A paper describes a structure:
[name]Δ33 crystals were also grown in the absence of acyl-CoA with the aim of solving the ligand-free structure. Unexpectedly, additional electron density not corresponding to protein, was visible within the ligand-binding tunnel. The density is also consistent with myristic acid (C14), which we hypothesize could likely bind during protein expression in E. coli. Even if the chemical nature of the bound species is not certain, this piece of evidence results in two consequences: [name]Δ33-C14 is not a true apo form of the protein, but it did disclose by serendipity the structure of [name] with a shorter alkyl chain bound in the effector pocket, as compared with [name]Δ33-C20-CoA. In contrast to the strictly symmetric organization of the [name]Δ33-C20-CoA dimer, [name]Δ33-C14 displays one full dimer per asymmetric unit, each protomer deviates from strict symmetry with respect to the other. The HTH domains of [name]Δ33-C14 depart from this relationship, after superimposing one protomer onto the other, the EBDs fit together well, while the HTHs are rotated by ~15°. Departure from intradimer symmetry is thus largely due to substantial flexibility in the region that joins the regulatory and the DNA-binding domains, not the hinge loop covalently linking both domains, but rather the whole region involving the HTH as a rigid domain plus the lower part of the regulatory domain’s helices that interact with the HTH (mainly the N-terminal half of α4). Using the position of conserved Tyr77 Cα as a reference (at the centre of helix α3, key to mediate DNA-binding), the two HTH domains in [name]Δ33-C14 are ~48 Å apart, vs ~57 Å in [name]Δ33-C20-CoA. In contrast, when the tunnel is occupied with a too short acyl chain, greater HTH mobility is enabled, allowing helices α3 to reach a proper separation distance to binding DNA (ideal B-DNA has 34 Å separation between major grooves on the same side of the double helix).
We had previously identified the transcription factor [name], as a key activator of fas and acpS gene expression. fas and acpS, respectively, coding for FAS I synthase and 4-phosphopantetheinyl transferase (essential to produce functional ACP), form a single operon in Mtb. [name]:DNA binding is regulated by long-chain acyl-CoAs, which are themselves products of FAS I, namely acyl-CoAs ≥ C16 disrupt the interaction of Mtb [name] with its cognate DNA6. [name] is a TFR member that senses long and very long acyl-CoA moieties, subsequently turning off FAS I-mediated fatty acid biosynthesis. We have now determined the 3D structures of [name] from Mtb, in three different states obtained with the protein (i) crystallised alone, (ii) co-crystallised in complex with the fatty acid C20-acyl-CoA and (iii) in complex with a double-stranded DNA oligonucleotide bearing the specific [name]-binding sequence.
Numbering used by the authors:
A (entry chain A): 35 to 224
B (entry chain B): 40 to 142, 145 to 225
Write the structure that this text describes.
């Protein structure tokens, strides 16, 4: 596939500008200059500020979804899958500060295009966990989906607490605590 | 009267959403004049915050009462999860206003101060004889509250595909035994 290196450079700068300034104050002139290109060159890659914003959101969502699916699809047992998938989520939120704000701390949810890019994403990650959990479980499929929702919720909320509290314990202790809790439940917390 | 107005305002806010909801519609559905509504609430925002506060208090009081029990840890988990699913069924409007709300720092704080108080309680129970670093104990309490809420929201949003009792037991069993006990 032909690599549009100028597109990727633009998405990187646009991610920072949108997060740092907010959607309203962010401008195409600011984004072009940050990338070191003229505004007409920016328009040869993106049609509008909204199409660029949606491409930025899509890039961060794709990175999260692909990271999670790669964890689920490149492991052979339940426990291993849990370890690698929890790790992948902590890695995403720690390593993609822009992606984290755009997906999880987003105010600009007033328009359907943005809200859809997040709601289709969350459901796809839950679908994947559900596919793995339901297989040879003997569970009613709705109970299996309920568990997948709970498992994703428990993992996301633990990770978000850790990041939002400015990493009060090491990343390793947070990952270990989250995995141990997801695997053994409250019965094995002590 | 105030309580009667909070009940009608809750229905108007749910039916129309915050932005489309109007003080004239709220006064009309309560069978009072608009000036009478204003003798109890200063603005649509003050009324909305009072509505959210009432529903949050009902939920929080139900959850803390469940956590007050001097039984075992799993029994307390069971009574608290039951109390949350019960809140969704007996106060459906409250559940929608707190958890399925499209609509600002005043609103977010009324939900955040609530969530933090319930997490404080779960943390107090979890930290007692676990030997955990307090931040790890709080992290687990956050996860436990989060998964319970998310399981219950799935069940409601999917139009109760299984009975409330089966949903409570499934949520409790997952919270207690974790993924290690899901096939069993
Ligand atoms: C919004 C994206 C959330 C990503 C959450 C990733 C971690 C959840 C744990 C997944 C475990 C898969 C199930 C299994 O191991 O059987
Ligand atoms: C934000 C709404 C709060 C919903 C509360 C759901 C139940 C939480 C689980 C409580 C578990 C108690 C643990 C224990 O006894 O060790």
């Amino acid at each position: 596939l032909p690599r549009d290196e100028r597109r990727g450079q633009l998405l990187v700068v646009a991610s920072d500008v949108f997060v740092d300034r907010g959607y309203h104050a962010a401008g195409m002139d600011e984004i072009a200059d940050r990338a070191g290109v003229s505004k007409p060159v920016l328009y040869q890659h993106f049609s509008s500020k909204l199409e660029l914003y949606l491409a930025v959101l899509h890039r961060h969502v794709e990175n999260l979804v692909s990271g999670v699916h790669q964890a689920l699809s490149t492991t052979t047992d339940n426990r291993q899958r849990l370890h690698v998938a929890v790790q992948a989520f902590f890695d995403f939120i720690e390593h993609d500060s822009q992606g984290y704000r755009l997906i999880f701390e987003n105010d600009f949810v007033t328009e359907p295009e943005v809200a859809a890019q997040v709601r289709v994403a969350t459901e796809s990650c839950i679908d994947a966990v559900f596919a793995l959990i339901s297989a040879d479980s003997g569970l009613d499929p709705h109970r299996a989906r309920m568990i997948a929702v709970g498992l994703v919720g428990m993992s996301v909320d633990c990770a978000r607490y850790w990041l939002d509290a400015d990493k009060p314990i090491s990343k390793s202790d947070a990952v270990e605590g989250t995995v141990q809790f997801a695997w053994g439940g409250l019965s094995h917390v002590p």
